[PDB]
Structure formats: C-alpha cells, structure tokens
Design a protein around this ligand. Sequence first.
Ligand SMILES: NS(=O)(=O)c1ccc(NC(=O)NCCCCO)cc1
Ligand SMILES: NS(=O)(=O)c1ccc(NC(=O)NCCCCO)cc1
Ligand SMILES: [Zn+2]
Length: 257
Amino acid sequence: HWGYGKHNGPEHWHKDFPIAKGERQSPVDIDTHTAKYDPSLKPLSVSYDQATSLRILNNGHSFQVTFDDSQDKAVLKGGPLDGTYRLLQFHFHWGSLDGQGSEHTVDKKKYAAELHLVHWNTKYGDVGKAVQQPDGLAVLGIFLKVGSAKPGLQKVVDVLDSIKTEGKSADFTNFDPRGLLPESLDYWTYPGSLTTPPLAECVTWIVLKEPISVSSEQVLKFRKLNFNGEGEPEELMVDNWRPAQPLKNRQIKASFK
Ligand SMILES: NS(=O)(=O)c1ccc(NC(=O)NCCCCO)cc1
Ligand SMILES: NS(=O)(=O)c1ccc(NC(=O)NCCCCO)cc1
Ligand SMILES: [Zn+2]
C-alpha cells in the first residue's frame, strides 16, 4: 500500500489513484504576491466550544484525533464556505528536520509541520458522501514552526507514547481544539483535494496565514511515532507530507491585504 517511502511515496500514488495528476490537487505553494485579496470573503466562524473529542489513533500515516460529528458540536462556517461544516478529526504532517514537514508552502518556504482540521458539509449527511462532492470538505490548515511550546498541544504530545505503532488507539476525551489555533484567522483559500489517497477533489482549503509555534520537545515526540505496526521492523513516522502540486487553473484568494 501507499505511504511515504521510496517505493510507495507520493510519486507512486498515481498508479493506484490516477486523480493524483488531476486538475485540483493539494497541497500547493502559496505565492503570496500572486494570491489576490478578495474583499467579498467573510471572516471565518470557528465554533468549537461544544467539541467532543473521542479517540486518538495511529493510522499508519499520521496520528489523528477524532470527534463526535453526529451533531453540530464543533463547526466551521463563513469564510469562503456556504453552509455548515462539522469537525470530524484533526491530524498532522511533519518532517524529519525542522526545515520541512508542511504540505502547503508559502513562497516556497516549508514549515516544520502542518495541522489539518477536517470538516464535512452537513448538507451531504455523512463524510463518505461528502468526499464525493466538489464542496464536500473544508480543511483548516495551520502551519507549525519550532520555537516556544504550544500549551494546547501538550495533552496530545503526552499521549503519543500510547499509540506508537499503526492501529493503536486511546481514549482522548475532553480535548479542546481551540488550544491549537493562532491568534489571527486571516487565511488563504483555494479549491483542492485530500492530500492522501484517495486524493479526492472535494476540499475547500482554508490555510491560516499565522503559524503556531511548538517546542523542539513537542515536535520530537511526533518523530518518535512509527509507520509500522507493533512487532514489525521499526520505521519512524517522519516526512509524512505530500509535496506541492501544480496550481493549474486555480487562483488562491486571500482574506487579508
Ligand atoms: N498506492 S501506490 O503508491 O500506487 C502503491 C501501491 C502498492 C505498492 N506495492 C508494493 O510496494 N508492494 C511490495 C510490498 C509487499 C511485501 O510486503 C506500492 C505503491
Ligand atoms: N490530509 S487531508 O487533505 O486533510 C485529508 C483529510 C481527510 C482525509 N480522508 C477522510 O476524511 N476520509 C473520510 C473517509 C472517506 C470515506 O470513503 C484524507 C486526507
Ligand atoms: Zn492532512
């Protein structure tokens, strides 16, 4: 199966997922001088006060925190979006070194990691239907740079020892994802895709301008996870990011000047 190694990495994915070479693939480089300020873009509405986290899971390609998405408990609205999008999960992509790890880039700059808060459009009823629609998902992407610690990330970091290998999960209730946001909600937006197979072209991307800072100790804990399952040769879960894809016939819009 697909992964991030020499023999199963992003350059191989098209053989099983031919949309990898499609017209609206993600991630992309955000060229800040070519993005256009759109004054019609509304501020994002992030409503996470009632979020109910459930589990944290090592899925063999990242780790993810899952939420109860059976009601409008944690929703994203506004911005470029029509309608209400429910938070299903968040996960990260990160590097083996601090100068790489993000999926999106900004003027070709790579960040140490990137957080994806994944939401689905409630008009489609469930996430499986939503992935089949051009406006089915909204992913809020947040860059991580290495510097001061992020207090709201620490509860995640401290449980990673319990989900070291693929398939492991743990209870992860009462986690507040608002602790992962930066101060500003200024964003870029463009139509794109999932950045892992099946690479479905169903995502409105909303990428925040302001990165969050995490400490070296926090990102080191990401890098101690394993791609492999327990009892298999150990391969550290690092560099689980897809590189920037061709922008093709798309314009990136900015909510700010
Ligand atoms: N989805 S993908 O990136 O196009 C892909 C799928 C299967 C493979 N298969 C593979 O490498 N098989 C050899 C390993 C089997 C022994 O455990 C590689 C890449
Ligand atoms: N890295 S990313 O672009 O934020 C991303 C987000 C969701 C997913 N997949 C997802 O939500 N799947 C829901 C199950 C699909 C049902 O067939 C894959 C990649
Ligand atoms: Zn992702």
